[PDB]
C-alpha cells in the first residue's frame, strides 16, 4: 500500500510519473483503499508517446480513492464500422493484416482547478470538468461538466451548481487558485465562508 | 485472501475489529472477490475516536463482496464555502494555518435487520437502511431506505417493496429477528414462505 | 499481474479454465488494471457442478478490464419469503436445520458474438446480450440486450442501435463471425467501413 492511512493522502506532484500527466499545485490524491499511487489512475496512458491524449489536472484538487481516468480514445474500436473488433491490433493473425487502424484520439482530458472528485468516480475519454465542479463518488462522467456544477450518477448529471450564476462569474474572474500564496493566506479567513461577494471585495481592494 | 471460497463467507462477529462497528448476530459478509475482511469495508472509520460516527449493522444481514460504507462525514470538505479544499488539514503549509475546520459529522450509518446488500453496493455517509430492505449490487445509496424496500441504481431508487403495506406492518410488529432462537427454529417452516399472515398467527399463538 | 501491459490483452481461449465457461474464437480480455485472468470474472461459478448455470461468450468479443458476470442465480436468497437469509446454507447452526433450499437457477448467461464490453461493466444473473451489442463501462446490465444495441448506465438502458433495422437484419443474416477465416480476410476491406449494404453484396456474391 502506497498509503499509510485512509486519512492521509499524498501530493500529485510527489507521485505522478507518467510524463503525459500534468498535475497542478496542492492537488492531492488519497488512495489507501486502492493502494496504488496516482499514476495507475490514468488508464491506458502511454508514458512513451508525445502523440497521445494527455490528462491535465488543475491546482487545489482533492481526489478520492480509486478514481479513474479512461484514456487512449476509442482504443481502435469503431462502433460505426461493421465490426467493433480491433483487427488492426491483432498482429499474430496474418489474416487480419489488411485491417485499417480504427483508432481515434479524443482530446486531452482536462480537470479544472478546485475539482473535488469522489472515490471511484470514473471519467470517460476527452471530458472536461470545469473549475469548482464537484464529482460525486461512483459518478460516471461521460461529458463536459460546468464550473461549480455538482454532478453524480451513472451517467453523471448535474444536480445543481454550488453558487449563484453571478457568484460563479465573480469567482471565475478573481481566480484565487492562481493567487500568489501570500494573498491566499491573506484572504484565508474569507475562503472559509460562502461570502463570494465579500471575497470579491477583499480581492478588488488588495488589487490596489 | 481472507476467504477460502466464493461460496463461503464469514460472520461479522468473527472478523469485525474496529470498535466503532457494531454488528449483530448471524449477519455475515462474503468478500472472496475483494479479499479483505469486513473491517476494510468501513471506509475512513477511526478505530481511535469515540467522537466519530459509527457503522451499525442489524442481525441476520447477508452482505455481498466489496460492499463499502463511506464514513467520516464530509471529511472536512464544505461545498458551500468558496473552496472545497481541506486547507485546515494541510498542516505542512504554514500559509494554511488560519484555516477553520470545515469538518462536519453526518450521523451514524444504520443498516437494519435482515438487510440484503448486493456486491459492491456503496453507501454514502449517514444513510439509514431499514429492516428487510434489499440493496441492489452496485447500488449507490445516497439517502434513507424504507423497511422492505428494493432499491438499486446510481443513484439508488426504490423499485418496489417486498410485501404489502399491511404485510410489512405485521412483520415490523413481530420482529422475528429479535426472537429467541428456539422460536426462530420453531417458526422456521413459515419463515421459508411468503405467508406473512400465516406467520403472524403462528406468532400471536406462541405468544400465549 | 497476469498481464504485462495495459495495452496488451490475452485470448479467452488461452486463459479460461472453469469448465462452465464456453468462450469463442478470437474473443479477448485485457485486465491489466484488475490483474486477474479471465476466470475470476465469472463470480460464484462452480467449476465442479454440471448442474449449474454457465457463462457463454460468443466469438470476436473485446472485453474490458475488471468486467464481472455475477452467477449462481439467487444464491439461495428468496426476496418473496419472509426472510432473505440463506438459513439452509448456514450449516453449523443446528436450529436452522429444517430450512428449505431457497436457491433457484437463472439460466445460462449468454454474450453474443462481437460484444464490446466496457471496463468494469457488471452483468446480473441470466442476462442475454445480443450480437454486436455494446456494453458501456460501469454499465450494470440487469436484463436482455438486443443485437447492435448500445447500452450504459446503472441500470443499463439502450441508448441507440449501431445500425438501421434493415442494416441489422442483413448483418444478422450473413453472420460474418461464423465465416471461414479466408472469407473474413477477403471481406476485410469492407469490415472496416459502415457500408453494411456493400458488405451484404460482397457476401451474396462470394456465396456463388
UniProtKB/Swiss-Prot annotation, chains A, B, C:
The catalytic activity, as recorded, is: chloramphenicol + acetyl-CoA = chloramphenicol 3-acetate + CoA
User: Which catalytic residues are annotated?
Assistant: 77
Q: Which UniProt keywords apply?
A: Acyltransferase, Antibiotic resistance, Repeat, Transferase
By its UniProt entry, which Pfam families does this protein fall under? Hexapep
The biological process GO terms on file are: response to antibiotic
Name the job this protein performs: This enzyme is an effector of chloramphenicol (Cm) resistance in bacteria. Acetylates Cm but not 1-acetoxy-Cm.
Entry protein name: Chloramphenicol acetyltransferase
Q: Which organism is it from?
A: Pseudomonas aeruginosa (strain ATCC 15692 / DSM 22644 / CIP 104116 / JCM 14847 / LMG 12228 / 1C / PRS 101 / PAO1)
Amino acid at each position: 500500500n502506497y498509503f499509510e492511512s485512509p486519512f492521509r493522502g499524498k501530493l500529485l506532484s510527489e507521485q505522478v510519473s507518467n510524463p503525459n500527466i500534468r498535475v497542478g499545485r496542492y492537488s492531492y490524491y488519497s488512495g489507501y483503499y486502492h493502494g496504488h499511487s496516482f499514476d495507475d489512475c490514468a488508464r491506458y496512458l502511454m508514458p512513451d508517446r508525445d502523440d497521445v491524449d494527455k490528462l491535465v489536472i488543475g491546482s487545489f484538487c482533492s481526489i478520492g480513492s480509486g478514481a479513474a481516468f479512461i484514456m487512449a480514445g476509442n482504443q481502435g474500436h469503431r462502433a460505426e464500422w461493421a465490426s467493433t473488433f480491433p483487427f488492426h491490433f491483432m498482429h499474430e493473425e496474418p489474416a487480419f493484416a489488411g485491417a485499417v487502424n480504427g483508432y481515434q484520439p479524443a482530446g486531452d482530458t482536462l480537470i479544472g482547478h478546485e475539482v473535488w472528485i469522489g472515490t471511484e468516480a470514473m471519467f470517460m475519454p476527452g471530458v472536461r470538468v470545469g473549475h469548482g465542479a464537484i464529482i460525486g463518488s461512483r459518478a460516471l462522467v461521460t461529458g463536459d461538466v460546468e464550473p461549480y456544477a455538482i454532478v453524480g450518477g451513472n451517467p453523471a448529471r448535474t444536480i445543481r451548481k454550488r453558487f449563484s450564476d453571478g457568484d460563479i462569474q465573480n469567482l471565475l474572474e478573481m481566480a484565487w487558485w492562481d493567487w500568489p500564496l501570500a494573498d491566499i493566506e491573506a484572504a484565508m479567513p474569507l475562503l472559509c465562508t460562502g461570502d463570494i461577494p465579500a471575497l470579491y471585495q477583499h480581492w478588488k481592494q488588495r488589487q490596489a
